[PDB]
Protein backbone atom coordinates (compact mmCIF):
# COMPACT_ATOMS: atom_id res chain seq x y z
CA UNK A 774 0.00 0.00 0.00
CA UNK A 775 1.65 3.16 -1.30
CA UNK A 776 1.40 6.25 0.91
CA UNK A 777 2.69 9.78 0.32
CA UNK A 778 6.16 10.25 1.77
CA UNK A 779 6.03 13.01 4.38
CA UNK A 780 9.73 13.72 4.29
CA UNK A 781 12.90 12.44 2.67
CA UNK A 782 13.45 10.16 5.64
CA UNK A 783 9.95 8.76 5.19
CA UNK A 784 10.59 8.26 1.47
CA UNK A 785 13.68 6.25 2.34
CA UNK A 786 11.71 4.06 4.75
CA UNK A 787 9.11 3.42 2.04
CA UNK A 788 11.76 2.54 -0.54
CA UNK A 789 13.24 -0.04 1.82
CA UNK A 790 9.81 -1.66 1.91
CA UNK A 791 9.38 -1.51 -1.89
CA UNK A 792 12.76 -3.12 -2.48
CA UNK A 793 12.42 -5.71 0.30
CA UNK A 794 11.85 -8.40 -2.35
CA UNK A 795 13.62 -9.59 -5.51
CA UNK A 796 11.74 -7.67 -8.18
CA UNK A 797 10.89 -4.00 -8.68
CA UNK A 798 7.51 -2.44 -9.39
CA UNK A 799 8.72 0.49 -11.48
CA UNK A 800 5.45 2.37 -11.61
CA UNK A 801 5.00 2.15 -7.84
CA UNK A 802 8.53 3.37 -7.19
CA UNK A 803 8.12 6.23 -9.67
CA UNK A 804 4.79 7.18 -8.05
CA UNK A 805 6.25 7.33 -4.53
CA UNK A 806 9.25 9.34 -5.74
CA UNK A 807 7.01 11.79 -7.54
CA UNK A 808 4.75 12.09 -4.46
CA UNK A 809 7.61 13.24 -2.21
CA UNK A 810 7.44 17.07 -2.22
CA UNK A 811 11.00 18.33 -2.34
CA UNK A 812 11.91 20.11 0.89
CA UNK A 813 15.34 21.73 0.54
CA UNK A 814 16.05 21.70 4.29
CA UNK A 815 15.80 17.91 4.27
CA UNK A 816 18.42 17.38 1.63
CA UNK A 817 20.68 20.39 2.06
CA UNK A 818 23.23 18.10 3.73
CA UNK A 819 23.68 16.14 0.52
CA UNK A 820 23.61 19.07 -1.91
CA UNK A 821 27.31 19.58 -2.33
CA UNK A 822 28.21 21.32 -5.56
CA UNK A 823 31.46 21.54 -7.48
CA UNK A 824 32.17 24.55 -9.67
CA UNK A 825 33.30 22.56 -12.70
CA UNK A 826 31.00 19.56 -12.95
CA UNK A 827 28.01 17.82 -11.47
CA UNK A 828 28.46 15.83 -8.29
CA UNK A 829 27.02 12.54 -7.00
CA UNK A 830 26.20 12.44 -3.32
CA UNK A 831 25.18 9.12 -1.75
CA UNK A 832 22.15 9.33 0.55
CA UNK A 833 21.23 5.70 1.28
CA UNK A 834 22.67 2.30 0.38
CA UNK A 835 19.33 0.54 0.36
CA UNK A 836 20.51 -2.44 2.36
CA UNK A 837 22.04 -3.66 -0.91
CA UNK A 838 19.14 -3.64 -3.40
CA UNK A 839 19.50 0.01 -4.41
CA UNK A 840 21.54 3.18 -4.07
CA UNK A 841 19.81 6.50 -3.53
CA UNK A 842 21.82 9.62 -4.30
CA UNK A 843 21.57 13.35 -4.93
CA UNK A 844 23.18 14.92 -7.96
CA UNK A 845 24.04 18.61 -8.00
CA UNK A 846 24.28 20.35 -11.34
CA UNK A 847 25.82 23.80 -11.66
CA UNK A 848 24.68 26.16 -14.38
CA UNK A 849 25.55 24.56 -17.68
CA UNK A 850 26.67 21.22 -16.15
CA UNK A 851 25.73 18.04 -17.88
CA UNK A 852 26.46 14.38 -18.30
CA UNK A 853 27.81 12.26 -21.09
CA UNK A 854 25.51 10.12 -23.15
CA UNK A 855 25.43 7.01 -21.03
CA UNK A 856 23.76 3.72 -20.13
CA UNK A 857 22.75 2.34 -16.74
CA UNK A 858 24.45 -1.04 -16.49
CA UNK A 859 21.33 -3.22 -16.60
CA UNK A 860 19.80 -1.37 -13.64
CA UNK A 861 16.60 0.51 -13.02
CA UNK A 862 17.29 4.22 -12.81
CA UNK A 863 14.87 6.79 -11.44
CA UNK A 864 15.53 10.54 -11.48
CA UNK A 865 13.42 12.99 -9.55
CA UNK A 866 13.99 16.74 -9.71
CA UNK A 867 14.43 18.38 -6.30
CA UNK A 868 15.36 21.88 -7.56
CA UNK A 869 15.65 23.53 -10.96
CA UNK A 870 15.15 21.87 -14.32
CA UNK A 871 17.13 19.36 -16.36
CA UNK A 872 17.02 18.54 -20.03
CA UNK A 873 17.03 14.82 -20.79
CA UNK A 874 17.99 13.83 -24.30
CA UNK A 875 17.29 10.23 -25.36
CA UNK A 876 19.47 8.27 -27.77
CA UNK A 877 19.23 4.83 -29.32
CA UNK A 878 21.86 2.22 -28.76
CA UNK A 879 24.37 2.70 -31.55
CA UNK A 880 24.96 0.13 -34.26
CA UNK A 881 28.46 -1.37 -34.41
CA UNK A 882 29.08 0.89 -37.42
CA UNK A 883 30.61 4.27 -36.59
CA UNK A 884 27.96 6.98 -36.98
CA UNK A 885 26.66 10.18 -35.44
CA UNK A 886 24.29 9.43 -32.58
CA UNK A 887 21.11 11.36 -33.37
CA UNK A 888 18.76 12.32 -30.58
CA UNK A 889 15.50 10.40 -30.61
CA UNK A 890 13.80 12.95 -28.37
CA UNK A 891 14.25 15.40 -25.56
CA UNK A 892 12.26 16.68 -22.67
CA UNK A 893 12.46 19.13 -19.84
CA UNK A 894 12.22 17.58 -16.42
CA UNK A 895 10.74 19.99 -13.95
CA UNK A 896 10.76 20.33 -10.20
CA UNK A 897 9.33 17.27 -8.41
CA UNK A 898 8.84 15.26 -11.58
CA UNK A 899 10.26 11.71 -11.57
CA UNK A 900 11.63 10.17 -14.77
CA UNK A 901 12.69 6.58 -15.35
CA UNK A 902 15.27 5.03 -17.64
CA UNK A 903 16.73 1.63 -18.28
CA UNK A 904 18.90 0.15 -20.98
CA UNK A 905 15.88 -1.32 -22.76
CA UNK A 906 14.53 2.23 -23.20
CA UNK A 907 17.84 3.55 -24.48
CA UNK A 908 20.71 5.84 -23.52
CA UNK A 909 20.47 9.41 -22.31
CA UNK A 910 22.25 12.64 -21.56
CA UNK A 911 21.05 14.87 -18.74
CA UNK A 912 22.01 18.55 -18.60
CA UNK A 913 21.28 21.68 -16.64
CA UNK A 914 21.00 24.17 -19.51
CA UNK A 915 20.13 27.05 -17.18
CA UNK A 916 22.47 30.05 -17.07
CA UNK A 917 21.12 31.20 -13.71
CA UNK A 918 19.74 28.25 -11.70
CA UNK A 919 21.59 25.26 -10.27
CA UNK A 920 19.63 21.99 -10.35
CA UNK A 921 19.41 19.19 -7.85
CA UNK A 922 18.06 15.73 -8.49
CA UNK A 923 17.43 12.55 -6.56
CA UNK A 924 18.46 9.30 -8.26
CA UNK A 925 17.67 5.70 -7.36
CA UNK A 926 19.44 2.81 -9.02
CA UNK A 927 18.66 -0.86 -8.56
CA UNK A 928 20.73 -2.92 -8.40
CA UNK A 929 23.44 -0.47 -7.45
CA UNK A 930 26.21 0.05 -9.98
CA UNK A 931 29.41 2.06 -10.06
CA UNK A 932 30.46 1.62 -13.66
CA UNK A 933 28.74 2.55 -16.89
CA UNK A 934 29.61 3.51 -20.46
CA UNK A 935 29.92 6.93 -21.98
CA UNK A 936 29.19 7.22 -25.69
CA UNK A 937 30.87 9.53 -28.16
CA UNK A 938 28.09 11.45 -29.88
CA UNK A 939 30.03 11.61 -33.17
CA UNK A 940 30.65 7.87 -33.54
CA UNK A 941 28.67 5.86 -31.03
CA UNK A 942 31.90 4.43 -29.64
CA UNK A 943 31.68 3.63 -25.94
CA UNK A 944 34.15 3.81 -23.08
CA UNK A 945 33.79 2.35 -19.63
CA UNK A 946 33.71 4.89 -16.85
CA UNK A 947 33.88 4.42 -13.11
CA UNK A 948 31.56 6.60 -11.15
CA UNK A 949 32.63 8.03 -7.88
CA UNK A 950 30.81 9.61 -4.99
CA UNK A 951 31.58 13.23 -4.15
CA UNK A 952 30.12 12.53 -0.74
CA UNK A 953 28.49 9.75 1.26
CA UNK A 954 25.92 10.33 3.99
CA UNK A 955 26.73 14.03 4.00
CA UNK A 956 30.47 13.50 4.31
CA UNK A 957 32.79 14.66 1.57
CA UNK A 958 34.74 11.65 0.28
CA UNK A 959 37.58 12.99 -1.82
Ligand SMILES: N[C@@H](CSOO)C(=O)O
Pocket residue numbers: 829844852855862863864911924948
Ligand atom coordinates in the same frame (compact mmCIF):
# COMPACT_ATOMS: atom_id res chain seq x y z
N1 LIG B 1 23.08 8.24 -14.53
C1 LIG B 1 23.72 9.50 -14.23
C2 LIG B 1 22.71 10.58 -13.96
S1 LIG B 1 21.55 10.78 -15.26
O1 LIG B 1 20.97 9.31 -14.59
O2 LIG B 1 19.30 9.39 -14.04
C3 LIG B 1 24.53 9.31 -13.00
O3 LIG B 1 24.08 8.54 -12.12
O4 LIG B 1 25.63 9.93 -12.84
Ligand SMILES: [Fe+2]
Pocket residue numbers: 855856857862909911
Ligand atom coordinates in the same frame (compact mmCIF):
# COMPACT_ATOMS: atom_id res chain seq x y z
FE1 LIG C 1 21.71 8.70 -16.41
